[PDB]
Amino acid sequence: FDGPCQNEIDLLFS
Amino acid sequence: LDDPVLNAIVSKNSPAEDDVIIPQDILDCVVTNSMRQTLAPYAVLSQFYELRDREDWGQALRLLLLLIEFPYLPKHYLVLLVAKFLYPIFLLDDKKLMDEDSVATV
């Protein structure tokens, strides 16, 4: 789901 | 806050709203700008405001909770959303019926 998806991948990389 | 933000998020990618965007008289981008993804949490705050004006208490509360639960919004915006919005408007909320699930998650 839009917003969660994008930020959730972003933390995992970081 | 102000109106061009406001306008742009609520007019969506449809020609909705007659409210001209920015200090220009252009209707041109009032048929474009559907605040989504990255701007989605921001979009949902402006829309929660539209909902009070179009007298929804139910869908209004719901949008405000959605953002409070979101774990990628800051933690320091807790005491801020509840103090200004949920705390005065205690009555309107109180009227409404809340179950075991909604209470425990909040």
From Swiss-Prot, chain B:
Part of the whole protein covered: 586 to 691 of 744
Record family assignment: Belongs to the nucleoporin Nup85 family.
More about this protein: Present with 7920 molecules/cell in log phase SD medium.
Subunit structure: Component of the nuclear pore complex (NPC). NPC constitutes the exclusive means of nucleocytoplasmic transport. NPCs allow the passive diffusion of ions and small molecules and the active, nuclear transport receptor-mediated bidirectional transport of macromolecules such as proteins, RNAs, ribonucleoparticles (RNPs), and ribosomal subunits across the nuclear envelope. Due to its 8-fold rotational symmetry, all subunits are present with 8 copies or multiples thereof.
Name this polypeptide is given: Nucleoporin NUP85
Physiological role: Functions as a component of the nuclear pore complex (NPC). NPC components, collectively referred to as nucleoporins (NUPs), can play the role of both NPC structural components and of docking or interaction partners for transiently associated nuclear transport factors. NUP85 is involved in nuclear poly(A)+ RNA and pre-ribosome export, in GSP1 nuclear import, in NPC assembly and distribution, as well as in nuclear envelope organization.
Compartments where located: Nucleus, Nuclear pore complex; Nucleus membrane
Source organism (scientific name): Saccharomyces cerevisiae (strain ATCC 204508 / S288c) (Baker's yeast)
